[PDB]
């Protein structure tokens, strides 16, 4: 069980840790989050009481270093930082615990929600999508754009998701225009799985990371990526049985975890109606089809 300490909380802010959130008042004596489950990626996220515009946060893995948060009053945000001096860091952490200045990552023993949303997400893959390779942790916010969005402007601060474009020479084999456009199996299985991702696990990691960035930051661009990666599988007549079984599970926990009140902006009516009712896998997503119908029947 690992800990992400805070030097201080100088500004009033709502702190997210994964799917949990805590209000902290301006100059309340708050000094971090303890008992963070080892083994998974985590995100710690922020929305200032005074500007609900700009949600931002940090993907990290406690196995990769000792990380802490410090408020920078120049740049105006909670900053994640690495403490290389390990003995200084244990000394800091042990104090704040003894003084009980730390909220405890509030995991119900039965609750597998985080594992289920981050099952294929690995810090090494997050760091290739979010390039700032002098940190072991990745910064994301609401407004960061995607490589693909820039095509259609600051490269350093882009989300470098795998470009998916159904009307591209990548997607369409010369001489198989109709076959490849109506059945995207060659785009999914040869170009993307064999070609670019290597395996189903890295495909699902990127899909899951895009969803979480959509949900936690309302990143419009991650939303488009999450939907594109779903459509490409649903619009492929030929998908390994295990990918379909795993997709239904991934989508189930993502739909289950979505705030009820955000299904107007985070869910794309057209993509889901196609996936559940029209596409080749219309009958392959029982769990996702059931929760979508019982929780969001309006959208469909």
């Amino acid at each position: 069980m690992n800990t992400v300490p805070f030097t201080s909380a100088p500004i009033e802010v709502t702190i997210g840790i994964d799917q949990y959130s805590f209000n902290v008042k301006e100059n309340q004596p708050f000094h971090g989050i303890k008992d963070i489950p080892i083994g998974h990626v985590h995100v710690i996220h922020f929305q200032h009481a005074d500007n609900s515009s700009m949600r931002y946060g940090y993907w990290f893995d406690c196995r990769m270093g000792n990380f802490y948060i410090q408020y920078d009053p120049k740049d105006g945000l909670y900053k994640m930082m690495e403490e290389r001096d390990g003995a200084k860091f244990e000394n800091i952490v042990h104090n704040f615990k003894e003084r009980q200045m730390m909220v405890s990552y509030p995991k119900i023993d039965e609750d597998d929600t985080w594992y289920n949303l981050t099952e294929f997400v690995q810090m090494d893959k997050i760091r290739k999508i979010v390039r700032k390779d002098e940190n072991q942790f990745s910064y994301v916010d609401s407004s960061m754009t995607t490589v693909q969005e820039n095509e259609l402007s600051d490269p350093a601060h882009s989300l470098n998701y795998t470009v998916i474009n159904f009307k591209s020479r990548e997607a369409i084999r010369p001489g198989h225009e109709m076959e490849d456009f109506l059945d995207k199996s060659y785009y999914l299985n040869t170009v993307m799985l064999q070609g670019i991702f290597k395996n189903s696990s890295n495909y699902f990691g990127e899909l899951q990371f895009a969803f979480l960035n959509a949900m936690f930051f309302g990143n419009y661009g991650s939303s488009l990526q999450w939907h594109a990666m779903i459509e490409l599988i649903c619009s492929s007549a030929t998908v390994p049985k295990h990918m379909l079984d795993k997709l239904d599970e991934i989508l189930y926990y993502q739909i289950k975890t979505l705030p009820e009140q955000y299904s107007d902006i985070l869910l794309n009516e057209r993509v889901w109606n196609i996936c559940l009712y029209s596409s080749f896998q219309k009958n392959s997503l029982h769990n996702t089809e059931k929760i979508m119908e019982n929780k969001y029947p309006e959208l469909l």
């Binding site: 009307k167 591209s168 020479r169 369409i172 010369p174 225009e177 109709m178 456009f181």
Partner: protein
């Protein structure tokens, strides 16, 4: 994006553009089987690819053989249209290639787009105009070449005959759309109007009769009357 009355003069400027109409690509007669079920028998079709400035018609004849053992034929018709237009573009020298292709029906937007991915400097545009190009098969000599074709075949026409010698493209196109709109609303009446005077003939190298400017005015008047009559009938008004 789309093409309407607001940007209508665009059609007669000096960017090479083509209209594509796929409404006669896949044509069926519906009949009863011996068992008293229903079956279709396909007949020869055509892609109606037209340059509205010059009147050059690229008439790609679709022989019924292209449908043999194919499923979802009305969806295939769209993709076969896209494929043939792509091929025509690729057979044209660079300075003859169009900068735009306007599809008369929206269901052609994606098929043409996907077939034209190698030509990203060619805009694929829908139109909000309801253009009577379906009536192209009411033109005797186009109907003839399509029904006689024993194989895939591309036949080049000028659908304006020699009109451009005397009138603008704008005016030629209007005359054309008026003749086709008439033919589509009442083929019999329309064609009676065109041939009732035996002294005005169709030149062998032409599609329409050799009318004087005066006789065109009269014909054009008769086609406008026929289009209102039929509309008055359709709508009891």
């Amino acid at each position: 994006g789309a093409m309407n009355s607001s940007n209508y003069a665009e059609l007669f400027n000096n960017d090479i553009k083509l209209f594509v109409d796929d409404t006669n690509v896949y044509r069926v007669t519906v009949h009863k089987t011996f068992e008293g079920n229903v079956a279709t028998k396909a007949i020869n079709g055509c892609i109606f690819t037209l340059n509205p400035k010059t009147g050059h018609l690229f008439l790609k004849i679709i022989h019924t053989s292209v449908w043999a053992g194919q499923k979802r034929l009305s969806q295939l018709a769209k993709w076969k249209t896209a494929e043939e237009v792509s091929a025509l573009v690729r057979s044209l020298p660079k300075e003859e290639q169009p900068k735009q292709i306007i599809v008369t029906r929206k269901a052609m937007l994606d098929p043409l787009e996907v077939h034209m991915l190698d030509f990203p400097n060619i805009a694929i545009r829908p139109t909000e105009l309801r253009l009577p190009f379906s009536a192209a098969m009411s033109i005797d000599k186009l109907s003839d070449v399509v029904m006689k074709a024993t194989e895939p075949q591309m036949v080049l026409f000028n659908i304006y005959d020699d009109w451009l010698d005397r009138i603008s493209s704008y005016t030629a196109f209007s005359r054309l759309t008026l003749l086709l709109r008439a033919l589509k609303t009442n083929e019999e009446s329309a064609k009676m109007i065109l041939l009732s005077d035996p002294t005005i003939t169709i030149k062998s190298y032409h599609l329409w009769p050799s009318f004087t400017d005066e006789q065109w005015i009269t014909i054009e008047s008769q086609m406008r009357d026929l289009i209102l009559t039929e509309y008055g009938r359709k709508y009891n008004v």
